[PDB]
RNA sequence: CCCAUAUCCGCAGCAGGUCUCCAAGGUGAACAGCCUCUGGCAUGUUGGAACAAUGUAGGUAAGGGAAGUCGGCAAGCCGGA
RNA sequence: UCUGGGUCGGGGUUUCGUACGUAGCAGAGCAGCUCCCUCGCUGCGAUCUAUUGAAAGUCAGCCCUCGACACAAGGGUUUGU
């Protein structure tokens, strides 16, 4: 088995990551993070791996005024990969999933951080490259 | 004995470190004077006017890093002064500073 | 413990140093320090850069 | 020595070191030894005098 | 001063099990201490004089 | 004789106020801003030594990008041709 | 004190990125000299190349010196069961 170590989160609530699968969404505007208890005035932030409630801001109209669960799969903020390796991506990205983890889309474009290739196996099976 | 002359080099870019821009050249001259009062054992040192023209050559805030300096104790003959000896701090022009040590200077 | 080469300067990254960079086309680069990666992200060629390994083999400086 | 009785699994871990870094901490060091840096850089100008 | 090390972890059931992690260490320099005195304490109702 | 960051009014050698004449070189569209020459001055009623908190004035900042706040206040962005 | 610690110097480290001079049948081209040349040889010329991982800095709160040069039992004020 194994549990997720904490990483540098660096992706707060008001962020707009771009959607990285073939569901027709172009953005994912994060609105909260699942798992945060929070402290007074601290904003909920997410890293790679974290499941996230997000709404899409542009894209196909049957996706737009709803709240979808999503998983961040790439982050631009550097995090430490525990073999002393700091790793970061060109962009912040995520895929739309349901509460169980199956994707609404079917294929992920771009690489996928291996921290969410271990937590989310149905994401990891549609990834072209595991960075 | 008491009258002697030596040539020194003075690392100015370690005594001016961290002092503000408009005080670097004035502080340099009160580091020359403090270097000489410890090196020769005398108060009343006197800086030659071409020595501070040297330290002011690049303005108030860019001071030379090193300057070659000739110290000289002299018997204070112009008056019955409380300081029997004074120190003259004339300037030595030099191209490089590599491999220069403190040297005793003849008359 | 695998010793890996800097994608810009051709030097030798040891396992506590530098940072990796995954560009979103599949390519993974390694950088020795922030001097190397800011030179990389500003798109300049390491063969015009006098202190890199690729310069010193283009000009045969060894 | 500690005041407690160490019973956790992390407290009783036998360790075995594999590499110790010796890069210069006075800047971004690149070279673990002196003989490595000289064998990589080559003969400089100030040696051949 | 501080440096950093590489070692292989034996935590059965963990994510870093049988893998290489980088740990940050602290060097503490310890020459041998010289014993020059003995002092004895007695138990008292006011402590330990 | 002064004609004004000291000769005038403002209780004062008071950052205020108070009508005009002459007007160099460079940059540039330009009596713009910046740097210099003629002429003028000694930093504006004290120096010295330090580089703590808090200020006042100025800067920069990973990753997000108004989520702050009554309110994008402040700053930033934009800029010429 | 088996001295000592200072000031320079040297070495190590590291930062930036290859100094000035000089050389080049390197150079977009242009101007010249014609008994020349048998396609020359003087110039101007951003830049390039060699000398050159050079040059410059580096404890002031970096490291190691034993090289040089000085200086260090000197002062001042108080303290008794
Ligand atoms: Mg350091
Ligand atoms: Mg006044
Ligand atoms: Mg002032
Ligand atoms: Mg004054
Ligand atoms: Mg920022
Ligand atoms: Mg609001
Ligand atoms: Mg609020
Ligand atoms: Mg405003």
UniProtKB/Swiss-Prot annotation, chain A:
The keyword Cytoplasm applies. Keywords: Cytoplasm, Phosphoprotein, Ribonucleoprotein, Ribosomal protein. The keyword Iron does not apply. It is found in: Cytoplasm. The modification Phosphoserine is found at residue 8. Component of the large ribosomal subunit. The ribosome is a large ribonucleoprotein complex responsible for the synthesis of proteins in the cell. Belongs to the universal ribosomal protein uL14 family. PANTHER family: 50S/60S RIBOSOMAL PROTEIN L14/L23, LARGE RIBOSOMAL SUBUNIT PROTEIN UL14. This is Large ribosomal subunit protein uL14. It comes from Homo sapiens (Human). The gene is RPL23.
Curated annotation (Swiss-Prot), chain B:
It comes from the Eukaryota. The modification N6-succinyllysine is found at residues 38, 53, 58. The modification N6-acetyllysine is found at residue 58. One of its GO terms (cellular component) is membrane. It holds the Pfam family Ribosomal_L31e. The modification Phosphoserine is found at residue 81. SMART domains: Ribosomal_L31e. It is found in: Cytoplasm. The keyword Ribosomal protein applies. Component of the large ribosomal subunit. The ribosome is a large ribonucleoprotein complex responsible for the synthesis of proteins in the cell. Belongs to the eukaryotic ribosomal protein eL31 family. PANTHER family: 60S RIBOSOMAL PROTEIN L31. Component of the large ribosomal subunit. This is Large ribosomal subunit protein eL31. It comes from Homo sapiens (Human). The gene is RPL31.
Curated annotation (Swiss-Prot), chain C:
Belongs to the eukaryotic ribosomal protein eL24 family. There is a cross-link at residues 2, 27, 35 (Glycyl lysine isopeptide (Lys-Gly) (interchain with G-Cter in SUMO2)). Mono-ADP-ribosylation at Glu-4 by PARP16 inhibits polysome assembly and mRNA loading, thereby inhibiting protein translation. The modification ADP-ribosyl glutamic acid is found at residue 4. The modification N6-acetyllysine is found at residue 27. The lineage of its organism: Eukaryota, Metazoa, Chordata, Craniata, Vertebrata. This is Large ribosomal subunit protein eL24. It is found in: Cytoplasm. The chain holds residues 1 to 62 of 157 of the full protein. It comes from the Eukaryota. Component of the large ribosomal subunit. The ribosome is a large ribonucleoprotein complex responsible for the synthesis of proteins in the cell. Component of the large ribosomal subunit. Disulfide bonds: none annotated.
Curated annotation (Swiss-Prot), chain E:
Transmembrane segments: none annotated. It is found in: Nucleus, Nucleolus; Cytoplasm. Coiled coil: none annotated. It is not required for incorporation of RPL3 into ribosomes. Belongs to the universal ribosomal protein uL3 family. Component of the large ribosomal subunit. Interacts with DHX33. Component of the large ribosomal subunit. The ribosome is a large ribonucleoprotein complex responsible for the synthesis of proteins in the cell. This is Large ribosomal subunit protein uL3. It comes from Homo sapiens (Human). The chain holds residues 52 to 100 of 403 of the full protein.
């Amino acid at each position: 088995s194994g549990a997720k170590f904490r990483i540098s989160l660096g992706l707060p609530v008001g962020a707009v990551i771009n959607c990285a699968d073939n569901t027709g969404a172009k953005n994912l505007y994060i609105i909260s993070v699942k798992g945060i208890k929070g402290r007074l005035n601290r904003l909920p932030a997410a890293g790679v791996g974290d499941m996230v409630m997000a709404t899409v801001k542009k894209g196909k109209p049957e996706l737009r005024k709803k709240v979808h669960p999503a998983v961040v799969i790439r982050q631009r903020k550097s995090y430490r990969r525990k073999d002393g390796v700091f790793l970061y991506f060109e962009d912040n990205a995520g895929v739309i999933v349901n509460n169980k983890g199956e994707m609404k889309g079917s294929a992920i474009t771009g690489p996928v951080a291996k921290e969410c290739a271990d937590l989310w196996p149905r994401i990891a099976s549609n990834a072209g490259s595991i960075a | 004995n008491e009258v002697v002359t030596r040539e020194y080099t003075i690392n100015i870019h370690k005594r001016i470190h961290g002092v503000g821009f408009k005080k670097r050249a004035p502080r340099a001259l009160k580091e020359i004077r403090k270097f000489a009062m410890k090196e020769m054992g005398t108060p009343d040192v006197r800086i030659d006017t071409r020595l501070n023209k040297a330290v002011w050559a690049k303005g108030i805030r860019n001071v030379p890093y090193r300057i070659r300096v000739r110290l000289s104790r002299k018997r204070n003959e112009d008056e019955d002064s409380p300081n029997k000896l004074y120190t003259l701090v004339t300037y030595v022009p030099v191209t490089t500073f590599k491999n220069l040590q403190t040297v005793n200077v003849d008359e | 413990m695998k010793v890996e080469l800097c994608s810009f300067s051709g030097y030798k990254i040891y396992p506590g140093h530098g940072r990796r960079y995954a560009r979103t086309d599949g390519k993974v680069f390694q950088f020795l320090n922030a001097k190397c990666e800011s030179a990389f992200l500003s798109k300049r060629n390491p063969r015009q850069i006098n202190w890199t390994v690729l310069y010193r083999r283009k000009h045969k400086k060894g | 020595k500690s005041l407690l009785v160490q019973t956790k699994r992390r407290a009783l871990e036998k360790i075995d070191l594999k590499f110790i870094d010796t890069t210069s901490k006075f800047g971004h060091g690149r070279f673990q030894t002196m003989e490595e840096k000289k064998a990589f850089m080559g003969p400089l100008k100030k040696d051949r005098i | 001063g501080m440096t950093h090390i590489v070692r292989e972890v034996d935590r059965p059931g963990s994510k870093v099990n049988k893998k290489e992690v980088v740990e940050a260490v602290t060097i503490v320099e310890t020459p041998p201490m010289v014993v020059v005195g003995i002092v004895g304490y007695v138990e008292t109702p006011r402590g330990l004089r």
